[PDB]
Amino acid sequence: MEKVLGRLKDEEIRCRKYLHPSSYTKVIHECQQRMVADHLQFLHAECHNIIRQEKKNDMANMYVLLRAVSTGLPHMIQELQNHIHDEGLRATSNLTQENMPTLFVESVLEVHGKFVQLINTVLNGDQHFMSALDKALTSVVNYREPKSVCKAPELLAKYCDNLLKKSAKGMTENEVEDRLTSFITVFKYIDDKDVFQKFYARMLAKRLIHGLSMSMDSEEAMINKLKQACGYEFTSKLHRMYTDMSVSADLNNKFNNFIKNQDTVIDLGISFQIYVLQAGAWPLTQAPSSTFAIPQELEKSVQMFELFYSQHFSGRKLTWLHYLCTGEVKMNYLGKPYVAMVTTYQMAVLLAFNNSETVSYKELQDSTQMNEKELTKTIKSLLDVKMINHDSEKEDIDAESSFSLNMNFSSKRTKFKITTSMQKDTPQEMEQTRSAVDEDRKMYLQAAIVRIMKARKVLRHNALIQEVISQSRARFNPSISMIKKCIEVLIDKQYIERSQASADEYSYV
């Protein structure tokens, strides 16, 4: 390599000082096509060794010579892509479960930064090599275990949730901003952005409703960065969520002005402050369809707010949510030791205890009208925090379930919180999120399929697969089974049909 570059420089200055100016390119071309292109096999054979060894100057000279060759460069591109892929696998698959998201993103950032620095310095920043690096890192972060899972979107969502949540560890605003700006580089190669979008929507709901965000400006900056990463259709739901959480303050002010401008004194008796959210863009849902009974002292406020939202807004039914609802309660029954934050599910049975110390499961059922599962969950949560004690022989759930209040509660905290389901992340709800993602994937695939068929009405199976892969490449990587299921669904709805002459070709219904 050294001799070839030195002799090439000598020949360049020689032909420049001797020949006509119009022949310099031809002299160089014949001085390389018969010098390194004839010995291209040896250089290609040594290319993998020279890439893996990561010797700087020799790699730079090899890149110069292979760029001189018309068909000498792609082998080096493949060798470098394979090296980066192997380095990423050995730098990511060895990670532990003690802290997977933060360390995973840090390792991907370190590998990406080192390779970008190397490409910019000793590789002239070729776009072919940058594309090879992007493909290699895409294969690295999507280290899908065989036919089981894909942990990259969940890990990145957990990373964003960990860094943006108000934590006592301590992270300043500007550090959060630059860390997220670096994070977008990692997110730009996921090829599974739907799962990350849904997981980030869930974590944004959990953070915003409980007020765990350190600053709304951080959330807006993160949402803007995501919008610049993918597009508005990627972040429309998130932006609507943030807009609703911002305008919640104005809505509370308008509600307070409305209840201070009424003819009579409402006298709600509580520190009411609502979090009205749009039903169309929040990942919450009324899956627990169990009927809940609002306590009367809150029933007055619910009726007043329902009237307000029917007056100062129109055509908006107000689907109340309770399993996100929570608030503070006082306990001066036993001497007022502290004030307890409590979800309204447990607040209902607390008011039932306030009605009478001796209460059975049937009384809770007729006072709250809620299902057995949610009532059992609230009861076990109360006894797990030792709020109440089971008077039965066994402490688990039973048909009778006769118990009263535990008077031994003397917790030191003056604002002790009995609810801690801020993380949750049950595998059942994660599987539900995966199923919703799969349903959106099926919708997108059906949209692309019907659009293509309306465009041409005659395509084979392989072309359909290729165009579905290409068009949906910015969202996910669809499987053959998913596309077959979608085309079978369109068969079932008498929307699509295969050709009678050949099953490869399809038709229109």
């Binding site: 939202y309 055509g315 996100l324």
Partner: protein, 86 residues
């Protein structure tokens, strides 16, 4: 005795427009408005016209009249309200 102090709750709102219905009175457009539903003896049942905006939306005239005294924005779609019909 138990006393509740804070009830910071979450409410979901979704569009609940039903056909030929006043978005404010939550009743049929052709009938009287809920403001004129009471004291029907005083109401002549002729002044409750169906006001049509530029967005092809139907309210009672009294309803949109009371609406305009606070805001000049249509409640159904957040545009400025312009009458076109009577």
């Amino acid at each position: 005795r138990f006393e509740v102090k804070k009830w910071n709750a979450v409410a979901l709102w979704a569009w609940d427009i039903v056909v030929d219905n006043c978005a404010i009175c939550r009743n049929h457009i052709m009938d009287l408005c809920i403001e004129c539903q009471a004291n029907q003896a005083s109401a002549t049942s002729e002044e409750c016209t169906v006001a049509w905006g530029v967005c092809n939306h139907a309210f009672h005239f009294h309803c949109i009249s009371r609406w305009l005294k606070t805001r000049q924005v249509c409640p159904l779609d957040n545009r400025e309200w312009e009458f076109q019909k009577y």
